[PDB]
Amino acid sequence: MKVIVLGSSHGGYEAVEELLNLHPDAEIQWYEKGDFISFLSCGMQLYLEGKVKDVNSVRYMTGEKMESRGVNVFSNTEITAIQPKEHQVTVKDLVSGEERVENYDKLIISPGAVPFELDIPGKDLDNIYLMRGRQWAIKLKQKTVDPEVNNVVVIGSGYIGIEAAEAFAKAGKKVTVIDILDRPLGVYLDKEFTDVLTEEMEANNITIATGETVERYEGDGRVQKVVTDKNAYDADLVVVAVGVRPNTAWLKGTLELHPNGLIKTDEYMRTSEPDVFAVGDATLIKYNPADTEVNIALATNARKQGRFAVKNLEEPVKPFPGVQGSSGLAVFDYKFASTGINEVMAQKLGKETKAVTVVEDYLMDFNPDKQKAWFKLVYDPETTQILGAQLMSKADLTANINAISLAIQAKMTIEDLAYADFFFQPAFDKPWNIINTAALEAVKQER
Ligand SMILES: Cc1cc2nc3c(=O)[nH]c(=O)nc-3n(C[C@H](O)[C@H](O)[C@H](O)COP(=O)(O)OP(=O)(O)OC[C@H]3O[C@@H](n4cnc5c(N)ncnc54)[C@H](O)[C@@H]3O)c2cc1C
């Protein structure tokens, strides 16, 4: 059986791993159009901030190691087209220019997404950078120590834009973050959390310019100004972190696509065509908090979909269990984590929720190490089933969100969590820990 896997990033990589333990026998070709196998773009912040010194070690696999395991790795080789009826792909070797047709028994594609660019006047003056992959990681690092870079502007106030803002502020630059949305990180966190985080970033001289539409980049040769509908900002460097486009225009006409460009797949990762499976950022995933399919571009999703595509290679036998959208990050001193439905998700989905927020020290009063923690529990008004939760503290309490993700998937209620058995020991928590305490508040509010 011959399986061709497209992409060496999180989705393609786990499809090769599960192929190796479920079909050791198979002939596996692994294709990557780029030059570097399995660079971890998730580790770009650690590298930019100097925590990791070698950019080439920010990876989780090499072609050499996969070849020791019997996989045929083809880097600098692009899949140009798929011919799904005859079960063939056309591939182009990018160093020699040679094209060739390859036949397959099963095809798994994880083509990913590309950084979205603002296509506005000034579009590319030099020093308007993107943040994805090795090459952009290297170029961004060189700018961190450039004495000519004093002002950096990042467009986008989501996860990636805040990682770039923190890394340039820690390198000693003045950073302005611009976005049309009214709060940074609103897709992950509600206003009581992003209000604290906005103060924290402003303390580290990051200006957050919310509610503005970038109109043009100005400059001579290279960027010098970013002008919005409301203002103009000096910029020696712009990082555009506004979002991501699915890398699928080459597939139009071959596979069914949704209007926004994402590949249509069912719960077995099957596309519209027999024997080709699609996984990763270019797909929708079952989202258990709201029982619907949502595009949640996270590495954890691509990895699980990649293994489920191999489980369903022969027969649709193993429907995907669905995910809660869990994410986590440190922003200067704060470590936050969230899962499930928050305010912006409930809006998008037209879902009504109730929520309690507790802010208090997470250790008992006599303990000198005590610190404030914020915890918000979101639940269904009718059933009181748990729908989401967000937590933040300068202490790392983030592993508690792993219990809430399971609570959502098992459809537990506020009462289940108010009395759930969580350990107590006074150097670690209070007799009713952070989850218990917020669920006890919710039970009282519904009494
Ligand atoms: C800066 C940054 C920080 C992030 N941090 C986190 C984090 O901390 N936690 C988390 O869960 N997620 C994080 N993510 C999201 C995560 O990186 C993505 O969800 C995940 O990489 C998607 O995997 P993928 O396989 O779908 O696609 P991609 O990573 O986009 O990879 C697609 C791969 O396929 C290759 N390819 C595409 N087309 C072809 C072709 N036709 N022929 C051959 N090869 C091709 C591409 O070159 C690329 O190597 C982050 C993303 C970024 C950019």
PDB file of N, CA and C in Angstrom, residues 354-446:
ATOM      1  N   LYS A 354     -23.994  31.909  30.767  1.00  0.00           N
ATOM      2  CA  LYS A 354     -23.933  32.657  32.027  1.00  0.00           C
ATOM      3  C   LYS A 354     -22.498  32.440  32.494  1.00  0.00           C
ATOM      4  N   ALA A 355     -21.946  33.189  33.406  1.00  0.00           N
ATOM      5  CA  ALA A 355     -20.556  33.025  33.787  1.00  0.00           C
ATOM      6  C   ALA A 355     -20.361  33.570  35.192  1.00  0.00           C
ATOM      7  N   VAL A 356     -19.459  33.032  36.018  1.00  0.00           N
ATOM      8  CA  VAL A 356     -19.083  33.700  37.260  1.00  0.00           C
ATOM      9  C   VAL A 356     -17.593  33.992  37.135  1.00  0.00           C
ATOM     10  N   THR A 357     -17.014  35.066  37.663  1.00  0.00           N
ATOM     11  CA  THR A 357     -15.590  35.319  37.628  1.00  0.00           C
ATOM     12  C   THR A 357     -15.143  35.448  39.090  1.00  0.00           C
ATOM     13  N   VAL A 358     -14.121  34.706  39.563  1.00  0.00           N
ATOM     14  CA  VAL A 358     -13.567  34.811  40.902  1.00  0.00           C
ATOM     15  C   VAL A 358     -12.164  35.346  40.768  1.00  0.00           C
ATOM     16  N   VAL A 359     -11.772  36.318  41.582  1.00  0.00           N
ATOM     17  CA  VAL A 359     -10.431  36.888  41.566  1.00  0.00           C
ATOM     18  C   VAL A 359     -10.052  36.882  43.034  1.00  0.00           C
ATOM     19  N   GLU A 360      -9.115  36.062  43.467  1.00  0.00           N
ATOM     20  CA  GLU A 360      -8.692  36.111  44.859  1.00  0.00           C
ATOM     21  C   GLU A 360      -7.388  35.380  44.940  1.00  0.00           C
ATOM     22  N   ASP A 361      -6.735  35.378  46.081  1.00  0.00           N
ATOM     23  CA  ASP A 361      -5.487  34.677  46.230  1.00  0.00           C
ATOM     24  C   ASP A 361      -5.689  33.202  46.130  1.00  0.00           C
ATOM     25  N   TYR A 362      -4.797  32.497  45.444  1.00  0.00           N
ATOM     26  CA  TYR A 362      -5.038  31.074  45.275  1.00  0.00           C
ATOM     27  C   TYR A 362      -4.462  30.265  46.426  1.00  0.00           C
ATOM     28  N   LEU A 363      -3.748  30.876  47.365  1.00  0.00           N
ATOM     29  CA  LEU A 363      -3.273  30.170  48.540  1.00  0.00           C
ATOM     30  C   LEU A 363      -3.938  30.847  49.745  1.00  0.00           C
ATOM     31  N   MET A 364      -3.982  30.106  50.831  1.00  0.00           N
ATOM     32  CA  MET A 364      -4.542  30.578  52.081  1.00  0.00           C
ATOM     33  C   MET A 364      -3.745  31.770  52.567  1.00  0.00           C
ATOM     34  N   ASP A 365      -4.497  32.571  53.297  1.00  0.00           N
ATOM     35  CA  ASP A 365      -4.087  33.851  53.831  1.00  0.00           C
ATOM     36  C   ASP A 365      -2.788  33.849  54.624  1.00  0.00           C
ATOM     37  N   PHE A 366      -2.515  32.836  55.450  1.00  0.00           N
ATOM     38  CA  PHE A 366      -1.278  32.797  56.204  1.00  0.00           C
ATOM     39  C   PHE A 366      -0.098  32.497  55.306  1.00  0.00           C
ATOM     40  N   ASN A 367      -0.265  32.007  54.065  1.00  0.00           N
ATOM     41  CA  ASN A 367       0.893  31.592  53.287  1.00  0.00           C
ATOM     42  C   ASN A 367       1.545  32.749  52.538  1.00  0.00           C
ATOM     43  N   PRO A 368       2.801  33.143  52.789  1.00  0.00           N
ATOM     44  CA  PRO A 368       3.386  34.332  52.202  1.00  0.00           C
ATOM     45  C   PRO A 368       3.564  34.277  50.686  1.00  0.00           C
ATOM     46  N   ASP A 369       3.514  33.093  50.080  1.00  0.00           N
ATOM     47  CA  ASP A 369       3.642  33.005  48.654  1.00  0.00           C
ATOM     48  C   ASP A 369       2.368  33.264  47.905  1.00  0.00           C
ATOM     49  N   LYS A 370       1.278  33.578  48.606  1.00  0.00           N
ATOM     50  CA  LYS A 370       0.023  33.744  47.918  1.00  0.00           C
ATOM     51  C   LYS A 370       0.062  34.835  46.835  1.00  0.00           C
ATOM     52  N   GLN A 371      -0.678  34.628  45.724  1.00  0.00           N
ATOM     53  CA  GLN A 371      -0.811  35.575  44.608  1.00  0.00           C
ATOM     54  C   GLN A 371      -2.262  35.524  44.114  1.00  0.00           C
ATOM     55  N   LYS A 372      -2.767  36.624  43.522  1.00  0.00           N
ATOM     56  CA  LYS A 372      -4.110  36.672  42.930  1.00  0.00           C
ATOM     57  C   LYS A 372      -4.222  35.747  41.749  1.00  0.00           C
ATOM     58  N   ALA A 373      -5.397  35.193  41.568  1.00  0.00           N
ATOM     59  CA  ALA A 373      -5.672  34.465  40.364  1.00  0.00           C
ATOM     60  C   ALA A 373      -7.066  34.908  39.934  1.00  0.00           C
ATOM     61  N   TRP A 374      -7.271  34.881  38.619  1.00  0.00           N
ATOM     62  CA  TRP A 374      -8.544  35.213  37.975  1.00  0.00           C
ATOM     63  C   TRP A 374      -9.145  33.936  37.419  1.00  0.00           C
ATOM     64  N   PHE A 375     -10.409  33.569  37.639  1.00  0.00           N
ATOM     65  CA  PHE A 375     -10.911  32.356  37.032  1.00  0.00           C
ATOM     66  C   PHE A 375     -12.314  32.678  36.603  1.00  0.00           C
ATOM     67  N   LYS A 376     -12.713  32.366  35.377  1.00  0.00           N
ATOM     68  CA  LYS A 376     -14.056  32.648  34.905  1.00  0.00           C
ATOM     69  C   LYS A 376     -14.608  31.337  34.402  1.00  0.00           C
ATOM     70  N   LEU A 377     -15.816  30.951  34.825  1.00  0.00           N
ATOM     71  CA  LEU A 377     -16.437  29.702  34.467  1.00  0.00           C
ATOM     72  C   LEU A 377     -17.693  30.059  33.668  1.00  0.00           C
ATOM     73  N   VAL A 378     -17.845  29.538  32.441  1.00  0.00           N
ATOM     74  CA  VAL A 378     -18.925  29.878  31.521  1.00  0.00           C
ATOM     75  C   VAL A 378     -19.785  28.618  31.456  1.00  0.00           C
ATOM     76  N   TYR A 379     -21.093  28.735  31.591  1.00  0.00           N
ATOM     77  CA  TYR A 379     -21.918  27.534  31.621  1.00  0.00           C
ATOM     78  C   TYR A 379     -23.216  27.723  30.888  1.00  0.00           C
ATOM     79  N   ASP A 380     -23.903  26.697  30.482  1.00  0.00           N
ATOM     80  CA  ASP A 380     -25.195  26.839  29.834  1.00  0.00           C
ATOM     81  C   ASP A 380     -26.297  27.327  30.802  1.00  0.00           C
ATOM     82  N   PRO A 381     -27.084  28.386  30.603  1.00  0.00           N
ATOM     83  CA  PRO A 381     -28.144  28.800  31.489  1.00  0.00           C
ATOM     84  C   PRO A 381     -29.209  27.756  31.752  1.00  0.00           C
ATOM     85  N   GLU A 382     -29.574  26.962  30.761  1.00  0.00           N
ATOM     86  CA  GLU A 382     -30.570  25.939  31.006  1.00  0.00           C
ATOM     87  C   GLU A 382     -30.052  24.687  31.674  1.00  0.00           C
ATOM     88  N   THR A 383     -29.005  24.061  31.171  1.00  0.00           N
ATOM     89  CA  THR A 383     -28.614  22.807  31.722  1.00  0.00           C
ATOM     90  C   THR A 383     -27.633  22.901  32.866  1.00  0.00           C
ATOM     91  N   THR A 384     -26.987  24.066  32.936  1.00  0.00           N
ATOM     92  CA  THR A 384     -25.805  24.406  33.714  1.00  0.00           C
ATOM     93  C   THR A 384     -24.600  23.533  33.321  1.00  0.00           C
ATOM     94  N   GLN A 385     -24.545  22.915  32.129  1.00  0.00           N
ATOM     95  CA  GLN A 385     -23.346  22.183  31.683  1.00  0.00           C
ATOM     96  C   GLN A 385     -22.210  23.180  31.467  1.00  0.00           C
ATOM     97  N   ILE A 386     -20.992  22.772  31.713  1.00  0.00           N
ATOM     98  CA  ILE A 386     -19.839  23.642  31.545  1.00  0.00           C
ATOM     99  C   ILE A 386     -19.585  23.894  30.071  1.00  0.00           C
ATOM    100  N   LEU A 387     -19.366  25.140  29.674  1.00  0.00           N
ATOM    101  CA  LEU A 387     -19.137  25.472  28.298  1.00  0.00           C
ATOM    102  C   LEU A 387     -17.758  26.056  28.098  1.00  0.00           C
ATOM    103  N   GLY A 388     -17.102  26.616  29.110  1.00  0.00           N
ATOM    104  CA  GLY A 388     -15.779  27.171  28.906  1.00  0.00           C
ATOM    105  C   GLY A 388     -15.155  27.643  30.200  1.00  0.00           C
ATOM    106  N   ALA A 389     -13.910  28.085  30.188  1.00  0.00           N
ATOM    107  CA  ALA A 389     -13.307  28.639  31.378  1.00  0.00           C
ATOM    108  C   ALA A 389     -12.054  29.341  30.930  1.00  0.00           C
ATOM    109  N   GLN A 390     -11.658  30.360  31.674  1.00  0.00           N
ATOM    110  CA  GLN A 390     -10.461  31.158  31.425  1.00  0.00           C
ATOM    111  C   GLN A 390      -9.793  31.354  32.785  1.00  0.00           C
ATOM    112  N   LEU A 391      -8.474  31.350  32.840  1.00  0.00           N
ATOM    113  CA  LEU A 391      -7.788  31.547  34.096  1.00  0.00           C
ATOM    114  C   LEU A 391      -6.519  32.305  33.819  1.00  0.00           C
ATOM    115  N   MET A 392      -6.037  33.060  34.807  1.00  0.00           N
ATOM    116  CA  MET A 392      -4.821  33.845  34.633  1.00  0.00           C
ATOM    117  C   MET A 392      -4.195  34.084  35.994  1.00  0.00           C
ATOM    118  N   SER A 393      -2.890  34.126  36.124  1.00  0.00           N
ATOM    119  CA  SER A 393      -2.243  34.507  37.375  1.00  0.00           C
ATOM    120  C   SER A 393      -0.782  34.696  37.024  1.00  0.00           C
ATOM    121  N   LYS A 394      -0.002  35.361  37.890  1.00  0.00           N
ATOM    122  CA  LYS A 394       1.446  35.389  37.700  1.00  0.00           C
ATOM    123  C   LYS A 394       2.009  34.043  38.148  1.00  0.00           C
ATOM    124  N   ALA A 395       1.265  33.297  38.973  1.00  0.00           N
ATOM    125  CA  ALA A 395       1.642  31.949  39.317  1.00  0.00           C
ATOM    126  C   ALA A 395       1.205  31.047  38.137  1.00  0.00           C
ATOM    127  N   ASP A 396       1.880  29.945  37.843  1.00  0.00           N
ATOM    128  CA  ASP A 396       1.399  29.080  36.807  1.00  0.00           C
ATOM    129  C   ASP A 396       0.351  28.105  37.298  1.00  0.00           C
ATOM    130  N   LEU A 397      -0.923  28.377  37.020  1.00  0.00           N
ATOM    131  CA  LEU A 397      -2.017  27.493  37.382  1.00  0.00           C
ATOM    132  C   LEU A 397      -2.623  26.920  36.110  1.00  0.00           C
ATOM    133  N   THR A 398      -1.962  27.058  34.967  1.00  0.00           N
ATOM    134  CA  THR A 398      -2.572  26.781  33.695  1.00  0.00           C
ATOM    135  C   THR A 398      -2.964  25.344  33.497  1.00  0.00           C
ATOM    136  N   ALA A 399      -2.322  24.340  34.138  1.00  0.00           N
ATOM    137  CA  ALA A 399      -2.687  22.957  33.944  1.00  0.00           C
ATOM    138  C   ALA A 399      -4.098  22.675  34.435  1.00  0.00           C
ATOM    139  N   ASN A 400      -4.701  23.545  35.280  1.00  0.00           N
ATOM    140  CA  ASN A 400      -6.109  23.388  35.690  1.00  0.00           C
ATOM    141  C   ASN A 400      -7.077  23.507  34.522  1.00  0.00           C
ATOM    142  N   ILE A 401      -6.733  24.178  33.428  1.00  0.00           N
ATOM    143  CA  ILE A 401      -7.646  24.271  32.310  1.00  0.00           C
ATOM    144  C   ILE A 401      -7.762  22.867  31.695  1.00  0.00           C
ATOM    145  N   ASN A 402      -6.807  21.944  31.902  1.00  0.00           N
ATOM    146  CA  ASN A 402      -6.943  20.607  31.325  1.00  0.00           C
ATOM    147  C   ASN A 402      -8.104  19.869  31.939  1.00  0.00           C
ATOM    148  N   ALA A 403      -8.455  20.134  33.195  1.00  0.00           N
ATOM    149  CA  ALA A 403      -9.616  19.513  33.822  1.00  0.00           C
ATOM    150  C   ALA A 403     -10.881  20.113  33.231  1.00  0.00           C
ATOM    151  N   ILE A 404     -10.901  21.388  32.859  1.00  0.00           N
ATOM    152  CA  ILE A 404     -12.125  21.971  32.343  1.00  0.00           C
ATOM    153  C   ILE A 404     -12.402  21.468  30.946  1.00  0.00           C
ATOM    154  N   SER A 405     -11.366  21.303  30.120  1.00  0.00           N
ATOM    155  CA  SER A 405     -11.552  20.751  28.789  1.00  0.00           C
ATOM    156  C   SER A 405     -12.256  19.384  28.898  1.00  0.00           C
ATOM    157  N   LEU A 406     -11.818  18.464  29.782  1.00  0.00           N
ATOM    158  CA  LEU A 406     -12.454  17.173  29.988  1.00  0.00           C
ATOM    159  C   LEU A 406     -13.835  17.349  30.535  1.00  0.00           C
ATOM    160  N   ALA A 407     -14.058  18.297  31.452  1.00  0.00           N
ATOM    161  CA  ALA A 407     -15.378  18.527  32.009  1.00  0.00           C
ATOM    162  C   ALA A 407     -16.336  18.885  30.887  1.00  0.00           C
ATOM    163  N   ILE A 408     -15.942  19.674  29.881  1.00  0.00           N
ATOM    164  CA  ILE A 408     -16.832  20.054  28.784  1.00  0.00           C
ATOM    165  C   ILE A 408     -17.160  18.869  27.926  1.00  0.00           C
ATOM    166  N   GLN A 409     -16.129  18.157  27.499  1.00  0.00           N
ATOM    167  CA  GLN A 409     -16.288  16.933  26.749  1.00  0.00           C
ATOM    168  C   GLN A 409     -17.171  15.939  27.523  1.00  0.00           C
ATOM    169  N   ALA A 410     -17.083  15.707  28.830  1.00  0.00           N
ATOM    170  CA  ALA A 410     -18.004  14.817  29.485  1.00  0.00           C
ATOM    171  C   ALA A 410     -19.346  15.483  29.797  1.00  0.00           C
ATOM    172  N   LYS A 411     -19.637  16.734  29.438  1.00  0.00           N
ATOM    173  CA  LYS A 411     -20.913  17.379  29.717  1.00  0.00           C
ATOM    174  C   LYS A 411     -21.213  17.456  31.213  1.00  0.00           C
ATOM    175  N   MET A 412     -20.234  17.761  32.040  1.00  0.00           N
ATOM    176  CA  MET A 412     -20.470  17.877  33.466  1.00  0.00           C
ATOM    177  C   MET A 412     -21.107  19.239  33.676  1.00  0.00           C
ATOM    178  N   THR A 413     -21.650  19.442  34.877  1.00  0.00           N
ATOM    179  CA  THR A 413     -22.408  20.622  35.222  1.00  0.00           C
ATOM    180  C   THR A 413     -21.667  21.398  36.315  1.00  0.00           C
ATOM    181  N   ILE A 414     -22.060  22.638  36.626  1.00  0.00           N
ATOM    182  CA  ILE A 414     -21.457  23.395  37.722  1.00  0.00           C
ATOM    183  C   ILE A 414     -21.499  22.626  39.067  1.00  0.00           C
ATOM    184  N   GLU A 415     -22.546  21.838  39.323  1.00  0.00           N
ATOM    185  CA  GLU A 415     -22.636  21.109  40.559  1.00  0.00           C
ATOM    186  C   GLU A 415     -21.598  20.008  40.602  1.00  0.00           C
ATOM    187  N   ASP A 416     -21.337  19.330  39.480  1.00  0.00           N
ATOM    188  CA  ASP A 416     -20.304  18.304  39.442  1.00  0.00           C
ATOM    189  C   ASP A 416     -18.944  18.874  39.816  1.00  0.00           C
ATOM    190  N   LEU A 417     -18.626  20.061  39.298  1.00  0.00           N
ATOM    191  CA  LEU A 417     -17.348  20.672  39.586  1.00  0.00           C
ATOM    192  C   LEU A 417     -17.274  21.344  40.941  1.00  0.00           C
ATOM    193  N   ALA A 418     -18.394  21.839  41.504  1.00  0.00           N
ATOM    194  CA  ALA A 418     -18.344  22.476  42.811  1.00  0.00           C
ATOM    195  C   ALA A 418     -17.884  21.417  43.816  1.00  0.00           C
ATOM    196  N   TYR A 419     -18.259  20.140  43.653  1.00  0.00           N
ATOM    197  CA  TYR A 419     -17.869  19.150  44.658  1.00  0.00           C
ATOM    198  C   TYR A 419     -16.928  18.126  44.078  1.00  0.00           C
ATOM    199  N   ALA A 420     -16.274  18.352  42.943  1.00  0.00           N
ATOM    200  CA  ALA A 420     -15.323  17.393  42.410  1.00  0.00           C
ATOM    201  C   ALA A 420     -14.083  17.286  43.308  1.00  0.00           C
ATOM    202  N   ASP A 421     -13.535  16.076  43.429  1.00  0.00           N
ATOM    203  CA  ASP A 421     -12.452  15.826  44.308  1.00  0.00           C
ATOM    204  C   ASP A 421     -11.143  16.334  43.763  1.00  0.00           C
ATOM    205  N   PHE A 422     -10.673  17.482  44.204  1.00  0.00           N
ATOM    206  CA  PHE A 422      -9.362  17.940  43.774  1.00  0.00           C
ATOM    207  C   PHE A 422      -8.499  17.974  45.031  1.00  0.00           C
ATOM    208  N   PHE A 423      -7.250  17.523  45.005  1.00  0.00           N
ATOM    209  CA  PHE A 423      -6.445  17.527  46.241  1.00  0.00           C
ATOM    210  C   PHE A 423      -6.249  18.904  46.889  1.00  0.00           C
ATOM    211  N   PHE A 424      -5.950  18.874  48.190  1.00  0.00           N
ATOM    212  CA  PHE A 424      -5.567  20.078  48.934  1.00  0.00           C
ATOM    213  C   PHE A 424      -4.273  19.836  49.674  1.00  0.00           C
ATOM    214  N   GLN A 425      -3.351  20.792  49.582  1.00  0.00           N
ATOM    215  CA  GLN A 425      -2.167  20.811  50.426  1.00  0.00           C
ATOM    216  C   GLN A 425      -1.795  22.295  50.402  1.00  0.00           C
ATOM    217  N   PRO A 426      -1.607  22.971  51.548  1.00  0.00           N
ATOM    218  CA  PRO A 426      -1.555  24.429  51.633  1.00  0.00           C
ATOM    219  C   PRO A 426      -0.379  25.094  50.945  1.00  0.00           C
ATOM    220  N   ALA A 427       0.631  24.358  50.496  1.00  0.00           N
ATOM    221  CA  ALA A 427       1.667  25.001  49.700  1.00  0.00           C
ATOM    222  C   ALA A 427       1.219  25.070  48.228  1.00  0.00           C
ATOM    223  N   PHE A 428       0.125  24.391  47.833  1.00  0.00           N
ATOM    224  CA  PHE A 428      -0.300  24.326  46.430  1.00  0.00           C
ATOM    225  C   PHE A 428      -1.648  24.978  46.144  1.00  0.00           C
ATOM    226  N   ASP A 429      -2.606  24.974  47.091  1.00  0.00           N
ATOM    227  CA  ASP A 429      -3.928  25.514  46.824  1.00  0.00           C
ATOM    228  C   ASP A 429      -4.713  25.693  48.102  1.00  0.00           C
ATOM    229  N   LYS A 430      -5.997  26.022  48.013  1.00  0.00           N
ATOM    230  CA  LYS A 430      -6.929  26.191  49.127  1.00  0.00           C
ATOM    231  C   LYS A 430      -7.797  24.951  49.272  1.00  0.00           C
ATOM    232  N   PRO A 431      -8.484  24.702  50.402  1.00  0.00           N
ATOM    233  CA  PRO A 431      -9.330  23.506  50.569  1.00  0.00           C
ATOM    234  C   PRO A 431     -10.318  23.337  49.401  1.00  0.00           C
ATOM    235  N   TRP A 432     -10.881  24.414  48.836  1.00  0.00           N
ATOM    236  CA  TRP A 432     -11.729  24.372  47.653  1.00  0.00           C
ATOM    237  C   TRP A 432     -10.810  25.065  46.668  1.00  0.00           C
ATOM    238  N   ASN A 433     -10.319  24.330  45.672  1.00  0.00           N
ATOM    239  CA  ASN A 433      -9.287  24.899  44.816  1.00  0.00           C
ATOM    240  C   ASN A 433      -9.926  25.867  43.839  1.00  0.00           C
ATOM    241  N   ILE A 434      -9.167  26.432  42.919  1.00  0.00           N
ATOM    242  CA  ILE A 434      -9.665  27.417  41.961  1.00  0.00           C
ATOM    243  C   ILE A 434     -10.925  27.014  41.151  1.00  0.00           C
ATOM    244  N   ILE A 435     -11.011  25.742  40.714  1.00  0.00           N
ATOM    245  CA  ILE A 435     -12.147  25.257  39.967  1.00  0.00           C
ATOM    246  C   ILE A 435     -13.350  25.105  40.905  1.00  0.00           C
ATOM    247  N   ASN A 436     -13.149  24.450  42.051  1.00  0.00           N
ATOM    248  CA  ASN A 436     -14.207  24.280  43.044  1.00  0.00           C
ATOM    249  C   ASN A 436     -14.839  25.587  43.465  1.00  0.00           C
ATOM    250  N   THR A 437     -14.019  26.588  43.739  1.00  0.00           N
ATOM    251  CA  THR A 437     -14.473  27.863  44.194  1.00  0.00           C
ATOM    252  C   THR A 437     -15.368  28.571  43.208  1.00  0.00           C
ATOM    253  N   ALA A 438     -15.015  28.592  41.913  1.00  0.00           N
ATOM    254  CA  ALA A 438     -15.859  29.261  40.936  1.00  0.00           C
ATOM    255  C   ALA A 438     -17.134  28.461  40.714  1.00  0.00           C
ATOM    256  N   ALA A 439     -17.051  27.130  40.648  1.00  0.00           N
ATOM    257  CA  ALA A 439     -18.265  26.330  40.502  1.00  0.00           C
ATOM    258  C   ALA A 439     -19.179  26.525  41.731  1.00  0.00           C
ATOM    259  N   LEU A 440     -18.654  26.669  42.972  1.00  0.00           N
ATOM    260  CA  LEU A 440     -19.498  26.959  44.137  1.00  0.00           C
ATOM    261  C   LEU A 440     -20.218  28.299  43.996  1.00  0.00           C
ATOM    262  N   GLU A 441     -19.569  29.295  43.402  1.00  0.00           N
ATOM    263  CA  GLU A 441     -20.201  30.573  43.154  1.00  0.00           C
ATOM    264  C   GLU A 441     -21.347  30.487  42.158  1.00  0.00           C
ATOM    265  N   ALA A 442     -21.158  29.717  41.074  1.00  0.00           N
ATOM    266  CA  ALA A 442     -22.168  29.477  40.063  1.00  0.00           C
ATOM    267  C   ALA A 442     -23.357  28.760  40.699  1.00  0.00           C
ATOM    268  N   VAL A 443     -23.178  27.670  41.471  1.00  0.00           N
ATOM    269  CA  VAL A 443     -24.274  27.014  42.184  1.00  0.00           C
ATOM    270  C   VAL A 443     -25.057  28.024  43.026  1.00  0.00           C
ATOM    271  N   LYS A 444     -24.415  28.915  43.779  1.00  0.00           N
ATOM    272  CA  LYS A 444     -25.120  29.910  44.556  1.00  0.00           C
ATOM    273  C   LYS A 444     -25.896  30.838  43.666  1.00  0.00           C
ATOM    274  N   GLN A 445     -25.347  31.280  42.537  1.00  0.00           N
ATOM    275  CA  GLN A 445     -26.048  32.151  41.620  1.00  0.00           C
ATOM    276  C   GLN A 445     -27.260  31.433  41.019  1.00  0.00           C
ATOM    277  N   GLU A 446     -27.282  30.123  40.892  1.00  0.00           N
ATOM    278  CA  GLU A 446     -28.451  29.464  40.368  1.00  0.00           C
ATOM    279  C   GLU A 446     -29.294  28.956  41.518  1.00  0.00           C
TER     280      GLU A 446
END
